[PDB]
Design a protein around this ligand. Structure first.
Ligand SMILES: [Zn+2]
Ligand SMILES: [Zn+2]
Lengths: 76, 95, 91, 135, 191, 118
RNA sequence: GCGUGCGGUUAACAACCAACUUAGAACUGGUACGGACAGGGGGAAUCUGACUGUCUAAUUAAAACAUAGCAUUGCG
RNA sequence: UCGUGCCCCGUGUGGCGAAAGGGAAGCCGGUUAAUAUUCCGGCACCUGGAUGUGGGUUUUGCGCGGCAACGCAACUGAACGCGGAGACGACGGCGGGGGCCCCGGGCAGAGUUCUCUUUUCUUCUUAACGGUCUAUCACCCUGGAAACAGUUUGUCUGGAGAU
C-alpha cells in the first residue's frame, strides 16, 4: 500500500490503465476522507480533510473508473 | 648537543608540535626546520620530506622515537614530527 | 590496597597445584597479561592475541614474538649478532 | 618558500575527484566567510583521454582525445602538491568565488577549461598532467 | 589448519635473483606452537598474485617486505640459500634437499646454526636443535632468524583440562594409562 | 489471556535459522514471527573498518537495490574507506616520484662510470 | 523567535514527578515471632589418596584408574 | 584468399553426504466434523524472461551537488584481477528496543453488598510490506591541549590531534 500526497499524481494514477477500481472511505470521527484506487501492484490512498471540494474531486476523477463508497460493515 | 639545542629553542624561539601543525607551517612557508622521529610511519615521513623539498626546508631525522622527541621538547606527550619556526638564541639552523 | 601477600595473580588457583608450580606460573601469567609499548606507534597498547602473536590496538600491527613476552633475549642477541655479521659481510 | 601558488599542479586526495590531477587557479590562504580555512580554487580532469596507438584511425583518435574537466573549491588538507607546474593564461582568472554560486557560470568555466586543456594535450606537452595516476 | 607451512617452489627468480613478498597476516595454527605468516608474492608468469604460508620467525610483522632468493639481503624473514649466508648465522625451516620447501628447525624457539661451508663440492655443515651435525647441499634454503613463540614449555600446564585442550587438537593419545596398570593380556608390562 | 506461543514451522530447535520475535495481531492474539538473520555491514579491504553509507544486508538482498545505494561516489567506493584511498593515492604518488629519482641517479651513475671507463 | 557585545556563579532557589532499600524510636500480643514451608549438628584426632575428574549397565565408587609435575629411552 | 585455417587461457576434473549447519521470497482476518503462513477475501514479496511508456543522460558524448565524512529516482562497462558478505568460541557485568508482569484515570459489562467497599474482575488490539523523521560505535571540518584534559559500574583515550 502506498500513500499519495499530490492531487496531480493521484489524478495520473487514476488515469493509469491498470487502475481497476476506486473507493471512498469516510472517517467522521477523524473528519477525513480517503480515496483508494486499486492498481496492479499497489493500492494508492489519498487522504484529505472532509470537505465539499474533496467531494467534488469525484468529478475530476475519470468516468470509466468504477468508484464506490465504502459501507459501514465489511460483509463477507 | 641536539637535545640541548632543541631545549633552548623550546625556551626561546617558536615551535609547533605535531603532524597537522607541521604541515600547516610547511604550507605557510615560514618553517625554518623540520624534525622527524625515527619511528614515524614511512609514508608520513616521505610526505613530510616531499613537503620540505617543495618548501626548501631542512629536515633532521631524530634518532629517538616519538616519546623521546616529546621528552626532548620537554612535553609529557609523544611527538612524531615538529616544525621550528624561530631559532631564538640557538644555532640549530646553522648546521 | 594490597590484598594478597605473595600469590598475586596466582591467587585464582587457591590452595591447588603446589606453591612451587603456582610461583612458576605466576611470572609467565604476569608477563603474558602485561601491556607493552609499541615499537611502531609508541603507544602502550600491545597485547597478546595468541601463542607468540602480539597485536597493537592502536596502529593495528601484528607481530611474531615469544610465547609469553613480546621479545626473547635469544632473539635480541640474534638480532645483534646478525647486525654485526651483516656489517662484516658488507664491509 | 610558498609553493601553493597559481599554476601549481596538485593531486586531490578526498571527495568524488579523489586521485585526480588539478591545477591551482586561485590560492586563498587567509580563507573566506564560506570557507574559514586555507583553500584553493582549482581546475582539473575528471575523465582522462584514452591511449592512442599507431594503427588507430583519425576519427577514433579525435574521439579518444576528449577531456572532461571540472572546477572545484578544495581544502589544502585534501590536496597533495606536486613539483610539476602547468602555466596557462587561458585559465587565468577562469574561476572566482562567485563562479560557484551560479550553475551556468560553472558550465561556461568548464567549457573554457576543456578548450584550453584539450589544446595543451593536443600540443603534446605536460604529459604527466594528462596521464592518470594509478593506485 | 588451512595450508601446510612450506616455502615457495624453487624457481628461476629464487635461483638467480630474489623476489619480494609482503606479510599480510600473522595467524595462529591449531596444533602448532609456532605462529604462521601469510606472505603474498607476485607470479612472474601471470597477473594473479600467489599467497604462501611460512613459519613466522620472531620479529616479523604485518606490512613487512621479505625477500626470497640468492641475492636477498641478510635480514630476519628473508629466505636465502645456505651458500649465501656466512658462518654462525641461525636459520629456520631448513631444506634437507633443495626444493623440499623446508624440513629442519621448525618448532617454536628452535633454529639451525650454519657451522661451516665446503665450496669444493658445494656442501654446508649445519647444527640441529638436538645437537646433531648434518651436511646438506649449499643450495638448500632457510629463513633467517629464530622461530617465534619460544619459551612455550617454560609454563606448567598445571591442569588436566589444559593438557586435554592441548592434545585434543594435536590428536595425540590422551589420557595415557600405564602398562603396569593393565592386565597381562593387554600389555607386556601388564601385572 | 493466553500469552504463550508456539513455533510456526516444523523445526523445534533454537538454531541460528530459527529466530522469532513476538508480535500482537489485529485479532488481539500474541504470536511469533519468524525473522531472518541480521545483515552485516560491508567492510574495508585494507583496514577492516565498517564502510559508512553502505546498508547492512544479507548477501542476496544487494541484488534488489540500485548502484548508488551500494557504493560511494569515489575511487574504490564501497570497497575501501576514504582514509585508505587517501593513503593509497599519497603512497602511489610518492613511490612513483622516488622511482623517477632513482632512475635519474642510476643514469647519472652510469654516465659517470662510462666517463671513468672512457 | 534566533545572532553578537557584555555582565554572575547562593539556582546553596523554585515548580513538577518518582520507586525501592537501609537505619533509628515508641506502643502493643505472646506458650510460639525464618510461627507452615524452606533449611549446616558441631568438635579433638589417626590412617589414607595431592586436589577437580573416571570405572566394574545388573552385588564391590575405593588407598583402583587418570591427572598436572618429575625422570629415562629411541629417532635428523 | 595460398579460402578448408589461425589465435587466446590454465584451473583443474565426477557423484553422494545435514526435514537442527548455509540458504530468494507471505502477512492479517475469516472459514471445516476433521486441513490450513496451503483454502476464501484483502494486502504483498521473490526469481527469471521479453518488450513498451514516463522520467534521466548526451551538441562540453557516458549525471550533478557537498571543503570533507558523503548524498540524490536513474546516472555505460567485456576479458583479466582485488576485496567484502555468506562466515562463526565460552563467560561476566552495563545500555537501548519489543513482548510479558505491575500501578492510575475513563466508557461499557459482570460479580459482592448483615455491615463496609466512588469497590473486585473482564474488553480497550494493530500484522507482513512501504513512506518519512530519528536512534550507541565510527568517520569528517575548524582549532591546537600541563594549572593535563575528556571519561566508564568496570581506566581507557589524546600533538599519529584530545576537550
Ligand atoms: Zn602500535
Ligand atoms: Zn580502510
Amino acid at each position: 500500500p502506498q500513500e499519495v500526497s499530490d492531487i496531480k499524481k493521484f489524478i495520473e494514477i487514476c488515469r493509469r490503465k491498470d487502475a481497476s477500481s476506486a473507493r471512498i472511505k469516510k472517517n467522521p470521527k477523524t473528519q477525513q476522507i480517503k480515496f483508494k484506487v486499486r492498481c496492479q501492484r499497489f493500492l494508492y490512498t489519498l487522504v484529505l480533510k472532509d470537505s465539499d471540494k474533496a467531494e467534488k474531486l469525484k468529478q475530476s476523477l475519470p468516468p470509466n473508473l468504477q468508484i464506490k463508497d465504502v459501507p459501514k460493515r465489511n460483509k463477507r | 648537543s641536539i637535545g640541548a639545542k632543541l631545549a633552548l629553542v623550546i625556551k626561546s624561539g617558536k615551535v609547533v608540535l605535531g603532524y597537522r601543525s607541521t604541515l600547516k607551517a610547511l604550507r605557510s612557508g615560514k618553517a625554518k626546520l623540520i624534525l622527524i622521529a625515527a619511528n614515524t610511519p614511512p609514508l608520513r615521513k616521505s610526505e613530510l620530506e616531499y613537503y620540505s623539498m617543495m618548501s626548501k626546508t631542512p629536515v633532521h631525522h631524530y634518532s629517538g622515537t616519538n616519546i623521546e622527541l616529546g621528552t626532548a621538547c620537554g612535553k609529557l606527550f609523544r611527538c612524531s614530527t615538529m616544525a621550528i619556526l624561530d631559532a631564538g638564541d640557538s644555532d640549530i639552523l646553522a648546521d | 590496597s594490597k590484598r594478597t601477600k605473595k600469590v598475586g595473580i596466582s591467587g585464582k588457583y587457591g590452595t591447588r597445584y603446589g606453591a612451587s608450580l603456582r610461583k612458576l606460573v605466576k611470572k609467565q601469567e604476569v608477563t603474558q597479561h602485561a601491556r607493552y609499548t609499541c615499537t611502531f606507534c609508541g603507544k602502550n597498547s600491545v597485547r597478546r592475541t595468541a601463542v607468540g602473536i602480539w597485536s597493537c590496538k592502536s596502529c593495528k600491527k601484528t607481530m611474531a614474538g615469544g610465547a609469553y613476552t613480546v621479545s626473547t633475549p635469544a632473539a635480541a642477541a640474534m638480532r645483534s649478532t646478525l647486525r654485526r655479521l651483516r656489517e662484516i659481510t658488507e664491509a | 618558500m610558498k609553493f601553493l601558488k597559481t599554476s601549481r599542479v596538485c593531486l586531490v586526495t578526498r571527495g568524488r575527484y579523489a586521485g585526480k590531477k588539478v591545477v591551482i587557479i586561485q590560492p586563498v590562504d587567509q580563507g573566506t566567510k564560506s570557507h574559514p580555512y586555507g583553500h584553493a580554487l582549482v581546475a582539473g580532469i575528471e575523465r582522462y583521454p584514452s591511449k592512442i596507438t599507431r594503427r588507430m584511425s583519425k576519427a577514433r583518435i579525435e574521439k579518444r582525445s576528449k577531456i572532461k574537466p571540472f572546477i572545484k573549491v578544495i581544502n589544502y588538507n585534501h590536496l597533495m602538491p606536486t613539483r610539476y607546474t602547468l602555466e596557462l593564461e587561458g585559465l587565468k582568472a577562469v574561476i572566482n568565488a562567485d563562479t560557484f554560486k551560479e550553475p551556468s557560470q560553472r558550465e561556461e568555466a568548464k567549457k573554457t577549461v576543456k578548450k584550453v586543456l584539450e589544446d595543451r594535450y593536443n600540443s603534446g606537452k605536460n604529459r604527466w598532467f594528462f596521464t592518470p595516476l594509478r593506485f | 589448519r588451512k595450508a601446510p607451512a612450506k616455502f615457495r617452489p624453487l624457481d628461476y627468480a629464487e635461483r638467480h635473483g630474489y623476489i619480494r613478498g609482503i606479510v599480510k597476516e600473522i595467524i595462529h595454527d591449531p596444533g602448532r606452537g609456532a605462529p604462521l605468516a601469510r606472505v603474498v608474492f607476485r607470479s612472474p608468469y601471470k597477473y594473479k598474485q600467489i599467497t604462501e604460508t611460512f613459519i613466522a620467525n620472531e620479529g616479523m610483522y604485518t606490512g613487512q617486505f621479505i625477500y626470497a632468493g640468492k641475492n636477498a639481503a641478510l635480514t630476519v624473514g628473508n629466505i636465502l640459500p645456505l651458500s649465501s649466508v656466512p658462518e654462525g648465522t641461525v636459520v629456520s625451516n631448513v631444506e634437507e634437499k633443495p626444493g623440499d620447501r623446508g624440513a629442519l628447525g621448525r618448532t617454536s624457539g628452535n633454529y639451525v646454526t650454519v657451522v661451516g661451508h665446503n665450496p669444493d663440492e658445494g656442501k654446508t655443515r649445519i647444527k640441529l636443535p638436538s645437537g646433531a651435525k648434518k651436511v646438506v647441499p649449499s643450495s638448500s634454503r632457510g629463513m633467517i632468524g629464530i622461530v617465534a613463540g619460544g619459551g612455550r614449555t617454560d609454563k606448567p600446564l598445571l591442569k588436566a583440562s589444559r593438557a586435554k585442550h592441548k592434545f585434543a587438537v594435536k590428536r595425540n593419545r590422551w589420557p595415557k594409562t600405564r602398562g603396569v596398570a593393565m592386565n597381562p593380556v593387554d600389555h607386556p608390562h601388564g601385572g | 489471556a493466553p500469552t504463550r506461543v508456539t513455533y510456526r514451522r516444523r523445526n523445534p530447535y533454537n538454531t541460528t535459522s530459527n529466530r522469532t520475535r513476538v508480535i500482537k495481531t489485529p485479532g488481539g492474539q500474541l504470536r511469533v514471527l519468524h525473522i531472518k538473520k541480521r545483515g552485516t555491514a560491508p567492510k574495508c579491504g585494507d583496514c577492516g573498518i565498517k564502510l559508512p553509507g553502505i546498508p547492512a544486508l544479507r548477501p542476496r538482498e544487494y541484488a534488489t537495490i540500485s548502484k548508488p545505494k551500494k557504493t560511494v561516489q569515489r575511487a574504490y567506493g564501497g570497497s575501501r574507506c576514504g582514509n585508505c584511498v587517501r593513503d593509497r593515492i599519497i603512497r602511489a604518488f610518492l613511490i612513483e616520484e622516488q622511482k623517477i629519482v632513482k632512475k635519474v641517479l642510476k643514469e647519472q651513475s652510469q654516465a659517470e662510470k662510462k666517463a671513468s671507463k672512457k
